Design a binder for this molecule. Structure first.
Ligand SMILES: [Zn+2]
Length: 185
């Protein structure tokens, strides 16, 4: 879904990206993506390569992004930074980490930056997933206030309304980042 055509409902964003542990949004993932062409030491933003995806009929959003990479028309002679703002860290047991790993092996012109709102520890191999992504070249981190507000401002039908932080955004982000950094050693 291209933000040029459709922006995300605000409550869809809040419901899915809130990082409070006691709220349980296990059913869905929202993956906001953007692309930049790394040109000789500079980032060239590609405004049309921006959108968001959710799981659809059992197909995880991470696989659906890989599905559309061909339509992005990336030049394999160039270099690109793909950034994911994703509500859940990619999974291992349903294939996302392996598929993303394979994509990065055979698409070396792409560098993946994954910023996750929450760790998907419902997957018993969530740690194996994070390590496989790191070992594949992806830089994985936890979203902070800065990332949440950027996604609000970029991907949401907010109508000039500024980002309204949920309670404890900062505390949960710190704890999640400490967990992630420990996992990735
Ligand atoms: Zn998955």
């Amino acid at each position: 879904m291209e933000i040029l055509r459709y922006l995300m409902d605000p409550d869809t964003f809040t419901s899915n990206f809130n990082n409070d542990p006691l709220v349980l949004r296990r059913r869905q993932t929202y993956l906001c993506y953007e692309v930049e062409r790394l040109d000789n030491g500079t980032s060239v933003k590609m405004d049309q390569h921006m959108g968001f995806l959710c799981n659809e009929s059992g197909r995880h959003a991470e696989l659906r992004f890989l599905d559309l990479v061909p339509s992005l028309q990336l030049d394999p002679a160039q270099i690109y930074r793909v950034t994911w703002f994703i509500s859940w860290s990619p999974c291992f047991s349903w294939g996302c980490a392996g598929e993303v790993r394979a994509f990065l092996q055979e698409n070396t012109h792409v560098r993946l930056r994954i910023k996750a709102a929450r760790i998907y520890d419902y997957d018993p191999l969530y740690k194996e997933a994070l390590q496989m992504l790191r070992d594949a070249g992806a830089q994985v981190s936890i979203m902070t206030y800065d990332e949440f507000e950027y996604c609000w401002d970029t991907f949401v039908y907010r109508q000039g309304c500024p980002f309204q932080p949920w309670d404890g955004l900062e505390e949960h982000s710190q704890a999640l980042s400490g967990r992630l950094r420990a996992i990735l050693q």
